Amino acid sequence: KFKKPPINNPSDDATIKLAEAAVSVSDSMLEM
Amino acid sequence: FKKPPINNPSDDATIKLAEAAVSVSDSMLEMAKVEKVITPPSKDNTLTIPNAYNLQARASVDWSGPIEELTARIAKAAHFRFRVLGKSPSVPVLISISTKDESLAEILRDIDYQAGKKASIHVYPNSQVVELRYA
Amino acid sequence: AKVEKVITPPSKDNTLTIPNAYNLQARASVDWSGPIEELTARIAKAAHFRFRVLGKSPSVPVLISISTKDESLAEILRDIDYQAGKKASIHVYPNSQVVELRYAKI
Amino acid sequence: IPPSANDLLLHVLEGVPPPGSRRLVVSGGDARAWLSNEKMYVRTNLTILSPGWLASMTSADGTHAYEMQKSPVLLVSWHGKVMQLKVEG
Amino acid sequence: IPPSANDLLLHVLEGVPPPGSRRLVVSGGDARAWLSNEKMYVRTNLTILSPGWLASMTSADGTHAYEMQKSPVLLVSWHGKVMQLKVEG
Amino acid sequence: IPPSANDLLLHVLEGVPPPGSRRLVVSGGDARAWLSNEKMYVRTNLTILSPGWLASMTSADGTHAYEMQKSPVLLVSWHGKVMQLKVEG
Amino acid sequence: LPCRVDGACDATIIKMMTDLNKKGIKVASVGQNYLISIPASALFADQSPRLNWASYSLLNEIAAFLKQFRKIAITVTSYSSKYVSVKRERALTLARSRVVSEYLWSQGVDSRIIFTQGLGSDKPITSYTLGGDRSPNARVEITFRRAV
Amino acid sequence: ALKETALSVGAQAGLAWRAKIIDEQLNKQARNLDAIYDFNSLVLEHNILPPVLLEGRNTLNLADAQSIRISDRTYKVAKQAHFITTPPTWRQYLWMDYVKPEAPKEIWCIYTERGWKNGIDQANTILEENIARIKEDFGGMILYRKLLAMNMVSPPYVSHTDLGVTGDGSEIHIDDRVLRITALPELNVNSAEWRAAVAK
Amino acid sequence: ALKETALSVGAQAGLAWRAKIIDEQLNKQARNLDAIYDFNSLVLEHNILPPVLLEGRNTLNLADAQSIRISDRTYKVAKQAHFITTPPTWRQYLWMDYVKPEAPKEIWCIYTERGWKNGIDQANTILEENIARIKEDFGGMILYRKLLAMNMVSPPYVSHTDLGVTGDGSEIHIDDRVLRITALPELNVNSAEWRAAVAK
Amino acid sequence: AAAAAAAAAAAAAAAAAAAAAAAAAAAAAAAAAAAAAAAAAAAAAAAAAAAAAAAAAAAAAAAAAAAAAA
């Protein structure tokens, strides 16, 4: 039996692209 | 037991196609041999990394524009004096530095490089001054 | 290639500016068709060389396409320097540990 | 004197489509394409190789934005792999 | 020189509607809204946050009166809680 | 002063047909023939003998390109053998 | 239509992964860094840069396991225990890894680079130093990162 | 044809269902999105909404066969700075619209599933452009605050003409301050006073 | 007549099938054709696509009964050098088009086999001209690099008018370089400075 | 689909499907990095089919005649 460690909840596409926007606005924010 | 290669030329036309491929790829290389002209690193004209301990501070720059302002602030970030010799032309000479962590003397190395021959950078590290000349 | 290499003789190599090193004598095999800097960053990462960039990379990409099998990393960087003729050049400083990609002035 | 770029490449350097566009679905790669007026604009971070583009910008994070004529296939490099992307419209 | 406010904000700072209006029912919060001429006016003591208002007054007791364009939802703060109010008309 | 050659013989010295042509199938020999405007053009490396041509070029590798009027048979020498080639169109 | 599977299935990935761990080729699976660790007894002859003929079957499900992933650079690096000197040893392990990567790009990888190198017991995974290629230190390792 | 209108039945139902799911999926992350898209503490000193600057680096235009123009960076002022009363939330930019569609064999069932995923990913592209628009607008204001530090733009120059008691005897306004923006935020081309982002 | 439309059914199906077979037969040799038709490292110093020169040796024209003109070599500049952004691949020149034709006794069977080989060798002639066109275009660029060594053509003379910061305050471009081609690559007729290909 | 590791947990956009052990080999969205290398279109890699024509031949939008699809 093989398993990677973080088996989290099932996410959805909305929070996937909200997180992907959120990291670049955090990086832009951070550097400013 | 082993196998032939999967995308092998084991076919009488594909062999001629691929011997032609290695013949044109090395004939491409000896083309790039005859026109690729280098300058030797004895005569490279660029800056060398001036190995001072204030210059090995890890820095972070995002910018494009006129060289003197980055070299002024790279001097007062390095705690160095900044001298300019020469006359700044009416079109300014414009750099583009975008790294989000790289060391400071190498930031002076690619400003010397993106200056090229419109301007250049010397560092004198015993006196702790960086300096920018024109032509 | 014959008429070009007779009508100007190739004066020098690039092993003056890319010299080999112990930990550059690891070997690789590569097919490749992308831009140059991500390939060179992978070469220097597996050479344990710090990789750096001089000059701002142009608007059109500097595209190389290396297809080869088992040569040394030093000769891979040499053929990368050649296939980017007059747009970039690889420099290697082996008493330091740094592979450099130099873009052109134009 | 040539024009500078298109300034709408600033918009498609973000994810936002141009005003008054048509969406183009892109298969087989991470790109988004819109068609404004007989020209498509592609937000990607791949490198488009074959059909040739008229204008390009690139953001801070290596995302590029390309103005090009409408071609139904795009050829990119992904990570040295030659790759195909397919657009409908 | 700009206009001062609307003087009909004095009327909707009281509870009285403007002359020649249409009532708007407000759900989910203590507010009253009227529509005079393609503009609604809200008597509340909540704080409207999202859709933006053109004019405001406030009485002695913290009742506010807002002139704004017609938006079918109002977002307020109640007591630090972000809250929604819904208007029909 | 005569014309030099036809410059479209440079194209049919390569394998590429002239722009706006009609293909002619060639039987019984290694040649390709196209018909541009009441004139056929033959890429071959054989030597056409009987019906006479109006213009000729030859590449580096002994491939020849001939401008001639439309004749339904071509007579060539192959390697000293008199040979016939047959064209439809 | 666009393709659902890319010439691979996850059931076959874990089927080869159990079968390689049953034959003792240990597959570590950390993040997307994949490691398959091969003892040099299980491929070569002792202190030699030469494959045995039966060990290309072991390389067959190594290469058919390497079919299954989208990958950019495989690096293959080999190291064994001490035999004569570290210079002879590093020549051995460089020839060792370059021979197994020559067979792996004879076979099917969709990798764009295979980097390949050898070391002179400079990274040994146990302190127990029994012998030559029967040491568990004497091994080749094939590590990559599965792209997206 | 009946198969086509089966697909068209499935499309709008899938769009409205996906719109619903991502609306309370947005509302589950409501305080997090107020942290992300905090326009409220990005506004200027006289409650002026900052303008949206667009950065495009490393630009080529192929104008014709004879000529290209490259430029290294391009900054554009889009939808210029202006007096905002209450700052924008994320909900004007991200909230997709929920209506509940009340409008209703084997080929019908398989194409209403392919209509259902067509409605789902078409609602996903609407949401993707909504996130794209808020990332444009917010990161443009962030790009101002970079260039306002970095001296490539002007700050807005307000003017407060204070007036005393104002009006006739039927109407007074007591402290009557008229606030205008005279100078808009605006990129300077006199480029010697620019700055450069060197940190440690 | 039914035999004729049987042949016409067989023709396009044979063309599309032969188009399919040579498309993945091209894709099996994809890296080999990038080695052969490497346009990428044939471009010039300012990413200029080189022009296609055509060589015709040993030329006669019979103009009329009274007069011929021979010339020994003819060099033609076809589709002159120009600013390319990304270099051409082989796939614009060689890829034949795949559509899947969905449009359908004894005489039908024998003429659909003769239609099938008519579609096969007609697709072969399309592929033969595609290979012919890429061999023209690529070997023309090779013939430039011969004559650029051999001094029978000019190299292109670019001009980079550098501009500083450019525009109004709503739009700046920081390093604004306009690159033009002034002099096109062009065969010189002043023939005393020519070269000659002598090797060992 | 994601077979025998576990069932498919999520469907990560800008990626493949996410099984409930690891990342699967089955593509989730249309916009993942699926290895297209053989297209199937009239006048692909020239410009597309200029749709306004109604004749025998098929003309591309770059004004080439798609003789392999006419």
HEC string for chain E: CCCCCCHHHCCCCCCCCCCCCEEEEEECCCEEEEECCCEEEEEECCEECCCCCCEEEECCCCCEEEEEECCCEEEEECCCCEEEEEEEC
Verify whether the Cβ–Cβ distance C42 to G116 is below 8 Å. Answer: no
Nearest CA in chain B to C89: B38
Using CB atoms, which residue from H127, H139, H146 is nearest to A14? H127
Residue C106's nearest CA partner among D4, I177, H63 is I177
Locate I172 and state its tokens.
């700046």
C29, C69 contact by CB (below 8 A): yes
Nearest CA in chain B to H58: B96
Verify whether the Cβ–Cβ distance H197 to B62 is below 8 Å. Answer: yes
Question: Please, what sign has the CA dihedral across residues B58, B64, B68, B72?
Answer: negative
Using CB atoms, which residue from B59, B69, B74 is nearest to H194? B69
Locate I12 and state its tokens.
């396009």
Q: How many residues appear in chain J?
A: 70
Count other Cβ atoms within 10 Å, centred on residue A8: 9
- Distance from the Cα of E49 to chain H's closest Cα (Å) equals 6
- Distance from the Cα of G59 to chain B's closest Cα (Å) equals 9
Phi and psi at G105, nearest 5°, equal -95, -5
Verify whether the Cβ–Cβ distance D51 to J45 is below 8 Å. Answer: yes
Chains C and F touch (3+ CB pairs under 8 A): no
Helix, coil or strand: residue A7: coil
Contacts of residue I181 in chain H, CB cutoff 8 Å? 66-67
Contacts of residue D28 in chain J, CB cutoff 8 Å? 32-36
Give me the residues paired with residue I60 across strands. Answer: F56, I70
Q: Is H136 left (phi over 0), alpha (psi -120 to 50) or beta?
A: alpha
- Alpha helix positions (H), chain B: 14-35, 68-77, 104-115
Cβ neighbours for B50, distance < 8 A, ≥ 6 positions apart: B105, B108, B123, B125
Residue C78's nearest CA partner among C22, C8, C16 is C16
Single-letter code of the amino acid located at G80? S
Verify whether the Cβ–Cβ distance G107 to B5 is below 8 Å. Answer: yes
How far is residue J4 from each of residues G12, J7, J19, J24, measured CA to CA in Å?
Answer: 9, 7, 9, 11
Distance, CA of G137 to CA of B72 (rounded, Å)? 55
Cβ neighbours for H95, distance < 8 A, ≥ 6 positions apart: H23, H26
Count other Cβ atoms within 10 Å, centred on residue H76: 22
Residue written as token pair 């007894």:
G41
Question: Please, what sign has the CA dihedral across residues D25, D27, D32, D34?
Answer: negative
Count other Cβ atoms within 10 Å, centred on residue E4: 13
- Distance from the Cα of A21 to chain H's closest Cα (Å) equals 7
Q: Which of I62, I70, I121 to mutate to test the interface with F (most CBs of F within 10 A)?
A: I62
Distance, CA of D25 to CA of D67 (rounded, Å)? 16
E70, E12 contact by CB (below 8 A): no
Give the distance from CA I166 to its chain's centroid. 39
Q: Which of F1, F6, F8, F13 to mutate to test the interface with I (most CBs of I within 10 A)?
A: F13
Contacts of residue E4 in chain H, CB cutoff 8 Å? 166-167, 173, 176
Q: Is I160 on the interface with C (CB under 8 A)?
A: yes
Distance, CA of I100 to CA of J40 (rounded, Å)? 8
Breaks (C-N over 2.5 A) in chain J follow: none
Contacts of residue H123 in chain A, CB cutoff 8 Å? none
Verify whether the Cβ–Cβ distance C4 to B34 is below 8 Å. Answer: yes
- Distance from the Cα of I182 to chain F's closest Cα (Å) equals 27
Distance, CA of H76 to CA of H55 (rounded, Å)? 7
Chains H and C touch (3+ CB pairs under 8 A): yes
Q: How many residues appear in chain D?
A: 89
Using CB atoms, which residue from H59, H76, H136 is nearest to D16? H136
Distance, CA of C28 to CA of C47 (rounded, Å)? 10
Distance, CA of C24 to CA of C15 (rounded, Å)? 13
Contacts of residue D61 in chain J, CB cutoff 8 Å? none
The counts of H helices and E strands in chain G are 3, 5
Nearest CA in chain E to H85: E52
Verify whether the Cβ–Cβ distance D75 to I91 is below 8 Å. Answer: yes
Q: Is H152 on the interface with I (CB under 8 A)?
A: yes
Residue I6's nearest CA partner among I154, I105, I119 is I105
Helix, coil or strand: residue G22: helix
Helix, coil or strand: residue F25: strand
Count other Cβ atoms within 10 Å, centred on residue J16: 24
- G71: which DSSP letter? B
Distance, CA of C44 to CA of C46 (rounded, Å)? 5
Chains G and B touch (3+ CB pairs under 8 A): yes
Verify whether the Cβ–Cβ distance G3 to J33 is below 8 Å. Answer: no
Burial class (CB in 10 A: 0-12, 13-18, 19+), H167: exposed
Q: Is A11 on the interface with D (CB under 8 A)?
A: no
Locate E14 and state its tokens.
């009281």
How far is residue J38 from each of residues D45, D53, D73, I30, I124, measured CA to CA in Å?
Answer: 22, 22, 10, 11, 19
- Distance from the Cα of A4 to chain H's closest Cα (Å) equals 27
Helix H or strand E segment including B85: strand B81-85
Give me the residues paired with residue B133 across strands. Answer: B85, B120
How far is residue E28 from each of residues E13, E31, E78, H26, J69, measured CA to CA in Å?
Answer: 20, 9, 11, 20, 64
How far is residue B37 from each of residues B110, D69, D72, F34, I132, measured CA to CA in Å?
Answer: 21, 37, 40, 46, 34
Chains D and E touch (3+ CB pairs under 8 A): no
How far is residue J50 from each of residues D37, D67, D71, D89, J13, measured CA to CA in Å?
Answer: 15, 20, 11, 11, 34
List the determination method: cryo-EM
- Distance from the Cα of B25 to chain C's closest Cα (Å) equals 9
Helix H or strand E segment including C77: helix C73-83
Strand pairing category for D82-88 and D73-77: antiparallel
Locate H98 and state its tokens.
């929920």
Taking every pair of C-alpha atoms in chain A, what is the biggest distance, in angstroms?
Answer: 47
Distance, CA of H135 to CA of F77 (rounded, Å)? 75
The data reach a resolution, in angstroms, of: 3.5
C47, C18 contact by CB (below 8 A): no
